[PDB]
């Protein structure tokens, strides 16, 4: 699609067989999902936002579906208020900013 | 232009003949720039996302030249770690997310 930006660019994603709403976020280096359980080994990481930091669980090589695109990548899980699809996965679905 | 997302989508902006780098951020409702003087009246606003909030000042009718496009709109000023062009101005320059 060509998604306009008058509203938040929210899409449907699927991970671990759970469907979630997530924000297409060119301002995020990484993909950060709200607190949830995921099987697998993980590493702790700290990420930064506009006014603070949150600790996340980094899972690697996770299959995740974004707006119908089956991709594989790193997902961070932690106390974000909104599920965020960041550049690590936006690049896999071929997403560009056009103006 | 069409901007891929392998790197952070940083572009040059001009505001009152001042040269500034800023991040094209589809995950931000609003535009927020690091501390600077801007003309006109303002009101305090809280903004946040990942982690805690920061207090900023809201100025209106501020022209910004973004990657060649002169636009005019609301600009928040405050202790953001990164200059951020949010949807309020992205829409004004005709920006979409395409895949």
């Amino acid at each position: 699609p060509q998604i306009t930006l008058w509203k938040r660019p929210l899409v449907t994603i699927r991970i671990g067989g759970q469907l979630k709403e997530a924000l297409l976020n060119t301002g995020a280096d990484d993909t950060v999902l709200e607190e949830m359980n995921l099987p697998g080994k993980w590493k702790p990481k700290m990420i930064g936002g506009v006014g603070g930091f949150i600790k996340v669980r980094q899972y690697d090589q996770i299959p995740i579906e974004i707006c119908g695109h089956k991709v594989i990548g790193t997902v961070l899980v932690g106390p974000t208020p909104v599920n965020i699809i960041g550049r690590n996965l936006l690049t896999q679905i071929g997403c560009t900013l056009n103006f | 232009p069409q901007i891929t997302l392998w790197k952070r989508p940083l572009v040059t902006i001009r505001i009152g003949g001042q040269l500034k780098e800023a991040l094209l951020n589809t995950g931000a409702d609003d535009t927020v720039l690091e501390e600077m003087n801007l003309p006109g009246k303002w009101k305090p606003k809280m903004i946040g996302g990942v982690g805690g909030f920061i207090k900023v000042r809201q100025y209106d009718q501020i022209p910004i030249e973004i990657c060649g496009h002169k636009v005019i709109g609301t600009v928040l000023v405050g202790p953001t770690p990164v200059n951020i062009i949010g949807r309020n101005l992205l829409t004004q320059i005709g920006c979409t997310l395409n895949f």
Partner: peptide, 10 residues
């Protein structure tokens, strides 16, 4: 109300 989701790797 959270509205700016800048996120950066460290």
């Amino acid at each position: 109300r959270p509205g700016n989701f800048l996120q950066s790797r460290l």
